[PDB]
Amino acid sequence: IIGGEFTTIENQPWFAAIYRRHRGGSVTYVCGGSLISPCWVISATHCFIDYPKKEDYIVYLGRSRLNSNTQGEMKFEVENLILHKDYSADTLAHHNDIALLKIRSKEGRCAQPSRTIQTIALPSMYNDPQFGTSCEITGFGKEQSTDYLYPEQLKMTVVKLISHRECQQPHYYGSEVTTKMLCAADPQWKTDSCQGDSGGPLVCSLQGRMTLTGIVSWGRGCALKDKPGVYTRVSHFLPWIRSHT
Ligand SMILES: COc1ncc(-c2nc(C(=O)NC(=N)N)c(N)nc2N2CCCCCC2)c(OC)n1
Structure with a gap:
């Protein structure tokens, strides 16, 4: 993180x-x-x-x-x-x-x-939050892309869901992102998942309850402009x- x-x-x-x-x-x-x-x-x-x-x-x-x-x-x-x-x-x-x-x-x-x-509760079928919704990500992944070590202590952060249309823009990921993925990122690109956070939860409040919305999957670097985190779309x-x- x-x-x-x-x-x-x-x-x-x-x-x-x-x-x-x-x-x-x-x-x-x-x-x-x-x-x-x-x-x-x-x-x-x-x-x-x-x-x-x-x-x-x-x-x-x-x-x-x-x-x-x-x-x-x-x-x-x-x-x-x-x-x-x-x-x-x-x-x-x-x-x-x-x-x-x-x-x-x-x-x-x-x-x-x-x-x-x-x-953690699973989402209902094809039901995700609206874009701009703040969700939490957690893991032991790198604190900086250049780091050799992983942090000793667990971390978490907040990222905002990005629309599929926004994510598929060429300066973002183009077609690399599919409808079975979700993008999320910080508006300043200042916080993100990274290597070693793979497989971990992206949790959003859905129907008034914390719900497993995504699974940390990939991205191009970490916390880089126009390169959101990409998550497996659990729903x-x-x-x-x-x-x-
Ligand atoms: C430009 O270099 C680069 N590219 C990809 C990764 C990488 N990123 C993520 C990741 O979640 N990225 C993100 N949210 N933007 C992630 N979940 N996993 C990443 N691995 C890096 C090695 C390849 C894929 C497996 C782990 C990385 O981490 C240090 N560095």
Whole structure:
């Protein structure tokens, strides 16, 4: 997250932290995710496509820091890793960039909701907020595009939804953006998602309730003029989500 503010997991208690085990023993951060039911985390396919073996991954819920343990956190294995069959990637765009992780603990359990661990509601079919609507994004991604390190502490920021017409302008993304994507950005381009925020939530208030509107997918740099963040449009994937869960 470029700009924004540091936060803790209580604020975004559906946020899932996904790591990969290396051949050797080391464990590195991969991507964010969102808890949509006790046994299911939703993320982005591009996070996993290079290493599509479920046994390599570890998922944490209730975790506010990258490389230290948060009190009350839970750790899970990946029972199932479901990538979208129609995934494709262009030089920039990732199409159908959505993935489901069924989680279960060493002892065979799913998530137990708590102050630090809660599900996020899915939107109703084809129902998104109006453009200009302020939504929140969360993750452990880079604080500056040039940084080598990821932040230790979880961050969040606010971005505003951009209309499909505005996004498809040539000086923005042209046709790279489809109707199964959403664009969001700051009016000054001063705050954004970035590398390492992939798979995490874009949350908007819908029908009076926090709702998972998007999943962090791609963009051209971070917090650059005329280059919004691009998000998988969750309201266009409900049959896929309902079927695969
Ligand atoms: C100009 O260089 C460049 N381009 C793309 C990325 C990148 N961006 C995002 C992203 O969300 N961008 C955005 N909201 N504008 C994102 N979610 N992921 C990004 N990766 C960079 C590597 C390629 C794609 C996977 C991770 C980047 O990050 C440091 N740097």
